[PDB]
Amino acid sequence: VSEEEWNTGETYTCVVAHEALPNRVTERTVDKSTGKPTLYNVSLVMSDTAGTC
Amino acid sequence: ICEDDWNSGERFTCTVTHTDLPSPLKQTISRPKGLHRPDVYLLPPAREQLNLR
Ligand SMILES: *[C@@H]1O[C@H](CO)[C@@H](O)[C@H](O)[C@H]1NC(C)=O
Numbered sequence: 001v002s003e004e005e006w007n008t009g010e011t012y013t014c015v016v017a018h019e020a021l022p023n024r025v026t027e028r029t030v031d032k033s034t035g036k037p038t039l040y041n042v043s044l045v046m047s048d049t050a051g052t053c
Numbered sequence: 054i055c056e057d058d059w060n061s062g063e064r065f066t067c068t069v070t071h072t073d074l075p076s077p078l079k080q081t082i083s084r085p086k087g088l089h090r091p092d093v094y095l096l097p098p099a100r101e102q103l104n105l106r
């Protein structure tokens with residue numbers, strides 16, 4: 001695909017139809033943000049740390 | 054009247070002479086003789102108490 005399409009972040013999904021799979025079909029996807037991405041932008045937030053119960 | 058006399062045990066005498074009653078009535082009251090430390094504990098509100106905001 002054109003690098004512009006990849007730079008857009010459009011997800012591409014590949015399917016494999018084969019006997020051994022449970023329901024005979026499996027899929028995986030990749031985009032600009034998950035294929036060996038340069039940057040991991042995380043905003044981890046925790047609230048009510050105590051939270052007794 | 055002084056607080057000490059009540060603690061000292063003096064029976065303060067109150068006389069009641071009612072119009073219908075011919076004989077005066079005598080009432081004498083003092084502190085009954087007969088002390089342990091009340092160590093106070095103040096429990097802060099629980100989080101669940103504070104959970105309602
Ligand atoms: C890095 O993280 C901060 C806060 O989590 C965010 O404001 C900033 O935009 C992030 N930078 C990049 C390049 O993702």
Ligand SMILES: *[C@@H]1O[C@H](CO)[C@@H](O)[C@H](O)[C@H]1NC(C)=O
Nearest residue numbers: 033039040041042043044045
């Ligand atoms: C990175 O994460 C921050 C915080 O969630 C967000 O404001 C920012 O837009 C994100 N940037 C990218 C490029 O994902």
